[PDB]
Amino acid sequence: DYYHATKTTIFNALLNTIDLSQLAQLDLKQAGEEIRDIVAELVAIKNVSMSVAEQEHLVQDIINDVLGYGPLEPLLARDDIADIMVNGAHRVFIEVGGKVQLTNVRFRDNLQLMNICQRIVSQVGRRVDESSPICDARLPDGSRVNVIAPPLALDGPTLTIRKFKKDKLTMKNLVEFASISPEGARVLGVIGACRCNLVISGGTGSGKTTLLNTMTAFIDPTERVVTCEDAAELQLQQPHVVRLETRPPNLEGSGAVTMRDLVKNCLRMRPERIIVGEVRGPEAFDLLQAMNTGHDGSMGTLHANSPREAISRIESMITMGGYGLPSKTIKEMIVGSVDVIIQAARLRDGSRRITHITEVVGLEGDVIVTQDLFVYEITGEDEHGKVVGKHRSTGIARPRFWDRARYYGLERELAEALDAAE
Amino acid sequence: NLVEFASISPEGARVLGVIGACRCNLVISGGTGSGKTTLLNTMTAFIDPTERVVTCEDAAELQLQQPHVVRLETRPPNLEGSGAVTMRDLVKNCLRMRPERIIVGEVRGPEAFDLLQAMNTGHDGSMGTLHANSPREAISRIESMITMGGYGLPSKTIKEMIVGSVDVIIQAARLRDGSRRITHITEVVGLEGDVIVTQDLFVYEITGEDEHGKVVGKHRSTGIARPRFWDRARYYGLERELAEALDAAE
Amino acid sequence: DYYHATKTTIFNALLNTIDLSQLAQLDLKQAGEEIRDIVAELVAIKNVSMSVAEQEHLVQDIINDVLGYGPLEPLLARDDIADIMVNGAHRVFIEVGGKVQLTNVRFRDNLQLMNICQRIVSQVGRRVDESSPICDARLPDGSRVNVIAPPLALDGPTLTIRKFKKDKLTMKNLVEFASISPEGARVLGVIGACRCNLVISGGTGSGKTTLLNTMTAFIDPTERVVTCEDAAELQLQQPHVVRLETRPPNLEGSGAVTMRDLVKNCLRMRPERIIVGEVRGPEAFDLLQAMNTGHDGSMGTLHANSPREAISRIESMITMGGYGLPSKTIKEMIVGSVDVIIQAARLRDGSRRITHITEVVGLEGDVIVTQDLFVYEITGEDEHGKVVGKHRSTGIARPRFWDRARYYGLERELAEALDAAE
């Protein structure tokens, strides 16, 4: 009550007291010091009595509202706040622990929200306004920002900040969550380390990107990896990694660099593994190439509920590339390129499991024959309702990729895991 | 209101509630005067409030009561031919807005393609209103739309994409007497050769006219016990209600 | 330390003193001499104590930074370094003896890296920037250069230079890799000479393009070759090679230039030969006409597993052309145009081999007849799983193209090579 009224009065006084342009020209530190001095002077003149800590907090809030990002600052600083979604000036949602929640943080007005969004976009040179109501940017700190202006967003400007998580999971975590049994972990390590042309299919909310990152953790440090992503999400720790990201066309429909262009260029960057953030268009073709022409070990995610569905989707994807490729030719391309498909899914109770680890055996006439090395078998629900299931090995002794494992000397672990996984 | 006006039998109401709740991809097709937009507004009440729904419209007609709805509206080109923000661009942006249900006010352009991608790339539960008279006509219209979008997609590819993405088509039409009722509730069950094979769950059978000129008819379920979207119901535990609804109107 | 500070001071003085525009009009030698004079004058004014060798080294470094390619230049000078890969201004990798190694070389910043990349590409009249982030070029000395701009490369501009290393694609490699026996190598040399129309069919991963390069290595220097490719990868070393490349349609689906267009426009450039990187669609018709209407000696890769399937796919491709040609007309066209089909495939163990060298002999009873000059007979496999086989000549001592050999004086060579296949 008293604090809110005092802050409002101080802001009103300071708005006329100091010209915005002069403060903008000044540096952040100098501008903040001047703002603090002006706030103290106004408080003294306004006969406002408050504690030193309260005065400092008010000064910081005023600086944030004038120079910073207003009430958005505490959320951005917080590490656990994965995503922030502002719908208008009176509704702010956060993503914590993978679940969305509402928050009491509220902007005073839509004009304040528009000013904050404009500051955020301009921080990387982008400007959003009625002449460009749509803005999408990657902040220098890795966070992605999407802004929709009032002309489109009826209930006020819309903002979406997706922060770059820094504690991305590891194979140990996935084993801990029982998403994959330890034998599955060893088999996945062998598959990743042995340069197996690999495709990570997954269902809705199946955490494909997390699995892909955990797998890229197995890459040999020396291999020169290249990462194409429609949105920077992967965090590879290898010393020699090249990260590329597409560029959607501006409102003028120019400057577009689709994933296909990035992959086609990557064919020429002399990589040893091309990692595609998510295959979504015809770039699948250019990804299946670079699995034949050397570059063994290229990975790529994909949205499918089962390996057969993944192969069908890849066929459709190559077909929509405009090439006059018959279906059998595309099937031959797929069977020769891919070596392992990993199907990860989110089960009924919200758990994430590696449902399948399957191998593309061959092409019989017209059907892509695949054999499942690892499967997840369900048995029902527990008393708490959680789905109960276990990982079982099909018992195959010589996976078609066994030659690769033998070449790197890892075939011992492969055989041991495939035998003990029973 | 729809149940009391006989627009849909109570079992049909339960089945539609299950379809909406379980984030089943929808395409509410309907003819002129059918009030398809009103039907879409009614359907967007079984959505989980937590789900982040983004509604793309042309005139802001939808009045979703959910707590996390982001309302977007296209901008028609100015008289000079610039400043245009077509629905396709709105949907493409929504793909990057982290939504869980991209709701399109009306699909009448290439946006359908993009919408289908949203339907088939994790945004399960997206709904789109379309102008067609029968589910087969709606499917053909969607294919023609995608083709006219300017891409090189072969017709077989577009048909495969439609089969993969869409999961339920609700046909709302105005009968000869002027009343509006739901006629078909059809799943796009698969693709055979070139033709898309679809199965109807609920079909409206007409039985002539009454004394006052109003059309006389009733809804009947096709008798299918395991609809394609059954798995989705299993996801949310709505298997029991779906089975009960499909059994009570056999 | 002291050298770095002196270099920084000298660079600042030169920038404040010399306008780069004036030097831009001067040649490399004149610009370098002027820069050396200016640097000597600046050092004398600053009275920086250094040796004659130290002064010369500083002057050369300044010239390279301002005129040359900066810290990247020494690596180019070295001969052992085959490829250079710069991933942002803060690290560089060099491929020595087939192994990638990190190097202490570091650019001043991403701005200097972008300037150096722009100079390197402009050396051939190309430009790279935010507007056109992706650039690919082939410098006259054979070096291939690929540059990605910051807007696509998150970590900074990425540069990839691949020096010529000319002798990595030749009959010696195939002979030693057991892809083709020496007799087969001589027969292929004869076929490459004598301008025999070729169609290099191959399965997925069969290295069709590598074989095509090896074959075009036989082309006589004086022949005006023209190459059409979806993505330029052929690296013919002849003096009179014209290189073309298709263009996909813009995001609006317009402005495309399909391979058929390039082939049709090839007939009007007076080419002695036409090389098509890969036939996929209607171009198969045009290309074949190019073979039939003079231009004998053309070539083209194709996706097929056996020569018979290659012929069938050529027929299907022509039929896709839209012309109402009856099947007999298409078969006659193929019989009269194509002279040799080379079927190269990847065997079970991942080895690549030229399975068939076959010759289209005639049409006969409405079914094209092919006689195989060379066939790979599989005998067995080693205890490691490696497959074992040998190339056997069918013994046909008078191939249809024999006359052509006699015309070019290679008949004796062909007879000797094919007679000793055993």
- For A259, the enclosing helix (H) or strand (E) is helix A259-266
A90 touches chain B (CB under 8 A): no
Shortest Cα–Cα distance, C256 to chain B (Å): 11
* Residue pairs spanning A and C at CB distance below 8 A: 100
For residue C381, what are the CA distances in angstroms to A403, A415, C386? 14, 22, 5
Chains sharing 3 or more CB pairs under 8 A with chain B: A, C
C281 touches chain A (CB under 8 A): yes
Residues in chain B: 250
Query: Any known ligand binding at C184?
Result: no
- For C114, the enclosing helix (H) or strand (E) is helix C110-122
- CB within 8 Å: B152 and C252: no
C158 touches chain A (CB under 8 A): yes
- CB within 8 Å: A136 and B50: no
Nearest residue on chain B to A88, alpha-carbon basis: B70
- CB within 8 Å: B122 and A204: yes
**Residue type at A13?**
A
For residue C174, what are the CA distances in angstroms to C184, C226, C307, C353? 10, 25, 20, 8
Nearest residue on chain A to C158, alpha-carbon basis: A242
Q: C356 near C376, Cβ under 8 Å?
A: yes
Shortest Cα–Cα distance, C146 to chain A (Å): 7
Shortest Cα–Cα distance, B186 to chain A (Å): 22
Nearest residue on chain C to B110, alpha-carbon basis: C252
**Residue type at C2?**
Y
Mutate to test the interface with C, among A264, A265, A275, A323 (most CBs of C within 10 A): A265
B240 touches chain A (CB under 8 A): no
DSSP state of C193: G
Considering only the beta carbons, identify the residue of A257, A267, A292 that sits closest to C204. A292
- For A365, the enclosing helix (H) or strand (E) is none
What string of H, E and C letters represents the secondary structure of A387-418? EEEEEEECCCCCCCCHHHHHHCCCHHHHHHHH
For residue C321, what are the CA distances in angstroms to B144, B150, C263, C284? 24, 21, 14, 8
Chains sharing 3 or more CB pairs under 8 A with chain C: A, B
A138 touches chain C (CB under 8 A): yes
- Sequence-distant (6+) residues with CB within 8 A of A386 are A349, A351
**Which chain A residues have a beta carbon less than 8 Å from that of C203?**
332, 336
B161 touches chain A (CB under 8 A): yes
Q: Any idea which residue has 């706040």 for tokens?
A: A81
- For C344, the enclosing helix (H) or strand (E) is strand C340-346
Q: Any idea which residue has 């005139």 for tokens?
A: B59
Q: A96 near A105, Cβ under 8 Å?
A: no
Neighbours of C77 (CB within 10 A): 7
Resolution of the coordinates, Å:
3.2
**Which chain B residues have a beta carbon less than 8 Å from that of C320?**
none
Q: Any idea which residue has 């055993």 for tokens?
A: C422
- Sequence-distant (6+) residues with CB within 8 A of A350 are none
- CB within 8 Å: B152 and C253: yes
Helical ranges in chain B per DSSP H? 10-21, 36-43, 87-94, 111-119, 135-148, 155-165, 230-236, 239-248
CA neighbor of A146 nearest in space, from A234, A84, A61, A62: A84
CA neighbor of B166 nearest in space, from B148, B149, B189: B189
- CB within 8 Å: B160 and A316: yes
Structure tokens at C24: 């831009």
Nearest residue on chain A to C232, alpha-carbon basis: A268
| Way it was determined | cryo-EM
- CB within 8 Å: A152 and B60: no
Neighbours of B76 (CB within 10 A): 11
Q: A336 near C204, Cβ under 8 Å?
A: yes
- CB within 8 Å: B152 and A320: yes
The strands making up A158-162's β-sheet, listed across from edge to edge, are: A99-103, A92-96, A83-87, A158-162, A144-148, A134-138
- CB within 8 Å: C350 and A403: yes
Chain centroid to Cα C158, Å, comes to 21
Distance between CA atoms of residues C98 and A109, nearest Å: 62
Query: Any known ligand binding at C316?
Result: no
Distance between CA atoms of residues C113 and C86, nearest Å: 9
Considering only the beta carbons, identify the residue of B72, B98, B121 that sits closest to A160. B98
A262 touches chain C (CB under 8 A): yes
Considering only the beta carbons, identify the residue of B72, B89, B164 that sits closest to A153. B72
Residue A272: strand, helix, or coil: coil
Query: Any known ligand binding at A138?
Result: yes
Q: Any idea which residue has 């404009």 for tokens?
A: A118
Neighbours of C356 (CB within 10 A): 22
- Sequence-distant (6+) residues with CB within 8 A of C183 are C391, C393, C417, C418, C420, C421
A244 touches chain C (CB under 8 A): yes
| Residue C158 β-bridge partners | C87, C148
Query: Any known ligand binding at C278?
Result: yes
What is the secondary structure of A304-325 as a DSSP string?
-SSHHHHHHHHHHHHHTTS---
| Residue B203 β-bridge partners | B184, B220
* Residue pairs spanning A and B at CB distance below 8 A: 84
Query: Any known ligand binding at A355?
Result: no
Structure tokens at C319: 């039929």
CA end-to-end span of chain B: 23
Structure tokens at C263: 């082939």
C81 touches chain A (CB under 8 A): no
- CB within 8 Å: C281 and A324: yes
Neighbours of C214 (CB within 10 A): 24
Residues in chain C: 422
DSSP state of A302: E
Chains sharing 3 or more CB pairs under 8 A with chain A: B, C
B60 touches chain A (CB under 8 A): yes
Distance between CA atoms of residues C115 and A2, nearest Å: 57
Shortest Cα–Cα distance, A285 to chain C (Å): 12
Query: Any known ligand binding at A390?
Result: no
Neighbours of A198 (CB within 10 A): 26
**Which chain A residues have a beta carbon less than 8 Å from that of C282?**
324
Q: Any idea which residue has 């006989």 for tokens?
A: B6
Shortest Cα–Cα distance, A109 to chain C (Å): 34
Q: Any idea which residue has 């999400």 for tokens?
A: A233
C27 touches chain B (CB under 8 A): no
Helical ranges in A18-155 per DSSP H? 20-25, 28-45, 52-66, 72-77, 110-122
**Residue type at C172?**
K
Nearest residue on chain B to A161, alpha-carbon basis: B97
Classify residue B221 by burial, with Cβ atoms within 10 Å: 0-12, 13-18, 19+: buried
- CB within 8 Å: A243 and C281: no
Query: Any known ligand binding at C411?
Result: no
| Residue C23 β-bridge partners | none
A240 touches chain C (CB under 8 A): yes
